[PDB]
């Protein structure tokens, strides 16, 4: 699915990347550097937009569903690790709503 | 202690 | 106390060094970036921003006239946190601990 993956990179990911809420999700959560000793115990599948970007740029995805799954993992990780009403959850919910608006227009 | 790392930590505190 | 350079050196070498090593000092070691942190009304509520990183470089570079001016910046930093946030917030519990330690150490000037 070359065309769907090209859209995920140039439209979906780029749109989220340019939002001012993107920065907490643009690189992996380094739990050691961030002094989060419990992060890897709770979150078993870390994921971020920087990793998604490199996977799209290096053709590591075989279809669009693989890429969409990584986006959802990123969002759920944030919802699981943080509480409702946390500032970062507000940012993630807005980014996910934005994500779903662009996934509606995915080509066939 | 600075830049992104400090900001991230700062964000998670709220 | 006439030698105000000495009291300021104590604030830097003893007071600030002790606070800097506290486990709850880190949220106050850089200026609050209200845009990046999505705090849209922060600069409207807080008119005199202050942080320990700014106090540190001011102490190191001979900015203050006397110790009370430096103490005034510490108090502004703490009150800013109390004003903008709600009682019982995690960051307020951290500010209260630093302030208690701060007031504990300035007694020994």
Author numbering:
A (entry chain A): 59 to 166
B (entry chain E): 1 to 14
C (entry chain C): 56 to 164
What do the authors of the reporting publication say about this deposited model?
Within this class of proteins, the bromodomain and extraterminal domain (BET) family contains four members that are transcriptional coregulators and that recognize acetyllysines (AcKs) using a tandem pair of highly homologous bromodomains (BDs). Despite heavy academic and industry investment in this area, the generation of paralog-selective inhibitors has proved elusive because of the extremely high sequence similarity between the bromodomains of family members (90 to 95% within the acetyllysine-binding pocket residues). Using the highly conserved BET BDs as a model system, we conducted three mRNA display-based RaPID (random nonstandard peptides integrated discovery) screens using a single library (which contains >1012 unique members). Crystal structures of 13 distinct peptide–bromodomain complexes revealed highly diverse structures and binding modes among the cyclic peptide ligands.
Sequence analysis revealed the most abundant peptide, 4.2A (making up 21% of all sequencing reads and a member of the largest family isolated from this selection), to be related to 3.2B. Remarkably, 4.2A presents a very similar surface to both BDs in the complex: The peptide sequence harbors two interdigitated Trp-φ-X2-AcK-X2-Leu-φ motifs (φ, hydrophobic amino acid) that are directed to opposite sides of the helix to engage the two BDs. Furthermore, peptides that belong to the same family but were derived from different selections (3.2B and 4.2A) adopted near-identical structures and binding modes.
